[PDB]
Design a binder for these strands. Sequence first.
RNA 1: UCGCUACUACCGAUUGGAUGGUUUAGUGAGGCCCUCGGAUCGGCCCGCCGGGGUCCCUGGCGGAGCGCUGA
RNA 2: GCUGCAGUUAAAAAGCUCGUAGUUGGAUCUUGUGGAGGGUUCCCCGCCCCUUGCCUCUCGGCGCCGGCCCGAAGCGUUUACUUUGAAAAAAUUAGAGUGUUCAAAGCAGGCCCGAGCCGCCUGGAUACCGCAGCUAGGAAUAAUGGAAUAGGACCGCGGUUCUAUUUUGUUGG
RNA 3: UACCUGGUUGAUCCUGCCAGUAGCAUAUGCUUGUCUCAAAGAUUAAGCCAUGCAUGUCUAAGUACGCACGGCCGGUACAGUGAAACUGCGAAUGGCUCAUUAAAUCAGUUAUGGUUCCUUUGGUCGCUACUUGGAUAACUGUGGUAAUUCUAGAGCUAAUACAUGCCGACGGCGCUGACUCCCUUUGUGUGGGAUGCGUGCAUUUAUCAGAUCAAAACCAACCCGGUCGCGGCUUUGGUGACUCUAGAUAACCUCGGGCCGAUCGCAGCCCUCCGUGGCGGCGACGACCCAUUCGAACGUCUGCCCUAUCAACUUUCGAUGGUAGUCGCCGUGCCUACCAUGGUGACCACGGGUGACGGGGAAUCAGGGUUCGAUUCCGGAGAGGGAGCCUGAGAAACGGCUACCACAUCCAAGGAAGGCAGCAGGCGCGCAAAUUACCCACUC
Lengths: 158, 263, 65, 206
Amino acid sequence: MADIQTERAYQKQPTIFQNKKRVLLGETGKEKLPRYYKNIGLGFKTPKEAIEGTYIDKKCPFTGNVSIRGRILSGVVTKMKMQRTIVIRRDYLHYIRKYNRFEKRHKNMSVHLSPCFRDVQIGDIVTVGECRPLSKTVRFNVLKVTKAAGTKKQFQKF
Amino acid sequence: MARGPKKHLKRVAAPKHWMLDKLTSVFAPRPSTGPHKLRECLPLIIFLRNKLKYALTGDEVKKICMQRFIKIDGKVRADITYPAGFMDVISIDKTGENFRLIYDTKGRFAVHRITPEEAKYKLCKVRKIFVGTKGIPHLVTHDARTIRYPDPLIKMNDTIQIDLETGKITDFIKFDTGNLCMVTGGANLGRIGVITNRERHPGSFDVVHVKDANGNSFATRLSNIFVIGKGNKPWISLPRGKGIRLTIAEERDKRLAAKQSSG
Amino acid sequence: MPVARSWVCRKTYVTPRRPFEKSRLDQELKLIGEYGLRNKREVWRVKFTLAKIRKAARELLTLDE
Amino acid sequence: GISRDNWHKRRKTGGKRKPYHKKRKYELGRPAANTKIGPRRIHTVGVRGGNKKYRALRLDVGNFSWGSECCTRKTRIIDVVYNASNNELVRTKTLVKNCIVLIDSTPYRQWYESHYALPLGRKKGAKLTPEEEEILNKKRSKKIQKKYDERKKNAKISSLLEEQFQQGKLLACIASRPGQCGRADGYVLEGKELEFYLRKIKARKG
RNA sequence: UCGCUACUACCGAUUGGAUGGUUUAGUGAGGCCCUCGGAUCGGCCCGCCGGGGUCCCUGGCGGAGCGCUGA
RNA sequence: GCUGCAGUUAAAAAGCUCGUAGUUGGAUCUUGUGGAGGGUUCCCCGCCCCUUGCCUCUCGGCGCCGGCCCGAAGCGUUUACUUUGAAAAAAUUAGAGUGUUCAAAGCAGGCCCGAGCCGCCUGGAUACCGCAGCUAGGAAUAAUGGAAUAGGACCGCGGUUCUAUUUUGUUGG
RNA sequence: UACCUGGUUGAUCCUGCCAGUAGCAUAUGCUUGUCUCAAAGAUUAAGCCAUGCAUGUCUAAGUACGCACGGCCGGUACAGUGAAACUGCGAAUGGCUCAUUAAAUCAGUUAUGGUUCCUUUGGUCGCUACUUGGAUAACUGUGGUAAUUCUAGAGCUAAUACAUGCCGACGGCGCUGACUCCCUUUGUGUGGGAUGCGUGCAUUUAUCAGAUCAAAACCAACCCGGUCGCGGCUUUGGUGACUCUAGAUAACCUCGGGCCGAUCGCAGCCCUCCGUGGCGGCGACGACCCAUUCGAACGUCUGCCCUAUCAACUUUCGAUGGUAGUCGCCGUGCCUACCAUGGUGACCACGGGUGACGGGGAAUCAGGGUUCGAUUCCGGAGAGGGAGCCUGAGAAACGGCUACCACAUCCAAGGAAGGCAGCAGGCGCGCAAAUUACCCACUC
């Protein structure tokens, strides 16, 4: 919040510039930084916390340098010990045709999760879309979070 | 290994609609690089040797072309494997005859003779719209033609008419409901009907629904629809059978009843 | 090497499963003697074309009228 | 030789993989430019598709922008002072993208003093009056002093730059890739970027 | 159990033998990149002669500095 | 041995009990009269209580002498299942036509006077193409979900803080 | 065609296996008259190879002083056929084999809004000049070595090879502003204006603008209809979505190291015109940039034979992730510095085996299945074993090159040369596989 330059190099959004002319503000002041953000398409909506926020993240869909294309998928949040990335589980049934019967299977995906989502928990349901390769094992990025079709965080009044 | 581009074609690998025999040979003519895709053209050698039968061998085709007799879209072509395709005109001024390439309702190129005043124009589908330096607008067609200063009402998926002596636009048809079209890919290849609905998806493919003269209904991906007339009337003459696609039982019954094929 | 040849062919008869069945031997010889044939293979050809005809009609009789 | 392939290294599970084929030419890599300060030395290489690429070994001069004033000019490069990635790159004076450098202030000072009709880099009267006062004051019929309110009411520079101009050097940041373009080229440090790197420079050695 | 004639496998002294894959420590051909090197080969500056012309063009012989400058 | 085997005595049930993953899991939550095709009541319209369950806009054609109506859209709690579209090399296999002298094959071939026809007609079908992904109907069966530390809703009110900067004749306040 | 029979007993009824019966594809034995098709050194040894062939190429249109052959005579550039040599293009396709290879290859499905692209086809092609420079090959002449498609010294001469460089069509439009004129000394509204600087598309970096919506009331100054307070408004294109496309400003620029023609062949023309100023008909070849076509490369989702006498594995010797950079055609731990402590597994990871190249497919088959697929179509890999690299649009190429390792040929002992898993042919192996033939007529 109050400081974000925790790295050895200065952190800023590309395409935003601050004028060093007409700088007078009197006894008070206003934000020296305007905010860059965009529409993703496909009927998704941009979070309020991306527009009203102050974080820097180049891999963010709403406020960074990525294009959402190809497949849209969903899965269950299962681990989150990395920084700005999480692991999600996908479960399915496989048909074996000699018998007339099914077999249970799973796979894991590592995905990139930006700030603007900040109340996610293990067992939440998440929707993701493809990007260019973002790191060695990461190809997908979080577009929406939900806990519909399931029990509450704490008691039923949540 | 594959260290660069290939330059041969095996005869069992060649496009099915050319109707090549099984036993004369191992190879087929590789179409010359050009305005139409390898799967979607007819090489000039297959038209002169196998369709029109003016030549018995590839050498008799070579010595027809080197005499400068054959014109495609009004230009003389000496290349025997040149990739001719849909809506092109071929003129043979020495025998006094003109042709246009159009699909038969079984999904293959028909021979279709035309009158010399209809051999003066062709129909083109729009692929792209863009702006160049100094703000000049550009157009691109399904057959690689580039046009400067198009009319600002001409949009994506529309059909334009061009005169072949000058290459400039004369008139156009808008893509909208109730206009006549022909199908240029998939299983419905070579059918004709009126556009009746367009269903759209953000990402992936749009789907168009089309209605026949006999009231049948069929659908395809938007990339396979070519518009050929404002409302009910086409801007080009059409081959025998007019795109109606009768079933194998109707085709049996007319073949018995009409006694054609020297019965 | 690639070549302009073709390799399609098939057999036109089948051999019986019981070689020495007395009831089968004299029935086949009575067909040879009445129609003036050369060998048993010349009878086994005609049983095979009839079996293929009946195999097709028994399939079409499953489908709705 | 050197190569940039994905197949020489292990999968998500920690398991090995065996080689699929010999090294291909499209998997190639090449040694680094390691560009120094010094009089121009550039070499060129042929690249995939038959195109050409430019590699700078020595550079003495660059193009820099003072974005606050809409002024850019060709300028001498003096020294390197900070590098976020590795300290051996400043110890050996190597020039790379987002490196922090010192540049000659003179062409910006000459643009400002002739545009605003005011002094900038000056200490005392002995470096104002004896020559070049005729840049500042001349005959100007109906354009003499009050019509320069279009200039004078917006002339004041930031205190952090007025302290740099008196020493004859400005801090700047490299924006081009010198080992790929053949050019060293960028923008003058200002505002909170200038406060950030002045704190980092002082906290390292001072 | 002991004994006669065939045939298959086990244990094991022998610091056995041949072939192949991993790997510690030391050595290292040859190409490519970089910093140097400079055999040899030219041009432009100073005589005389010749063709053209208001001493210069420009062909040739020739010597000093072999300057300056290129490969 | 899924369809489809066997374990008292022929080969074969852990000495006995607990228990995590895996497989399996009880009942329950909207129907009959009327019309068409067809029967002598049930499958399509419209109804006891809801029939696309709601809704009211606005860029955008219809019906008529502005206002009120009827096709998109928000979408119907989420999936499996099932039925239908689209899109997937050829050869091979199945399958239609056709007297290679018959057949295995092949993709051909057939009419007419004489040669004065400067020729004419016609084929090179069609089906199948698991799973996974795309698509539009059906809603039984099987998963899954909502308010108990009360919240749905009314053209319902009130304090307070942030805030786009439209409508005004514009550039500035 | 949804099928059974002999054999344990003195005799009976069962369990259960052995043997019989039919097809298919490898070897092998005995036997053989006619005629239409046609598989054939995969299995063992991706073991070793004598000899011959398997990739070359010219039009009217890049360079013709070869007496080589030739004409009616002559070079008016110079006739005409034209060996050789220089220059251009191709040789990265085709053909052969199946060693390696188990989420790898491959199939169906999707993506470049993360890249490159000879050629074809269509756009685009006006910020000494009536024509420049020197220098080599064929050829002529003299040589060296036991030896090779080894080459050295000397004398000549060309270009679409190599290297220079105008003319024409600057008349741009923005910024400076001596002076000057009008209402108001300045400011502020004007119109002129001497004189300087930059001024095509590509290239590197920085900055600017991108227009549209709901409702009133005061004040400075005015667009405008009018005059000393009211009505009324305007400006590239496109996607589901761009830090897209087009536009404006300040600089850079590659040079020896981006473009804007010092080129070739047919028919001749129209004139302030007698062979002059040009303008022009048909082309041929060439080059920077867009768009096409043929692709290539990297990535998404789902799909695999046997094994626990393989239960835990990976990890600055980069393992999983973050920030900045280098390198590369481009995304990315691809690699480097600093930091964090991650990632996979009983829903079988990690390790080992395979007489394992994958798929379209093949044999047998009531219904359900079992077994096979080196092999003519499609994808991959490799040219004795490993590694490195030149040229080019494209190769980590083997009918290209350099070196080590294993074989091996010639020698005058100094040296030189090599790669049949192409077509025929040979040796070795083994149960096991054809002729050192003819032709570009057909298909390409």
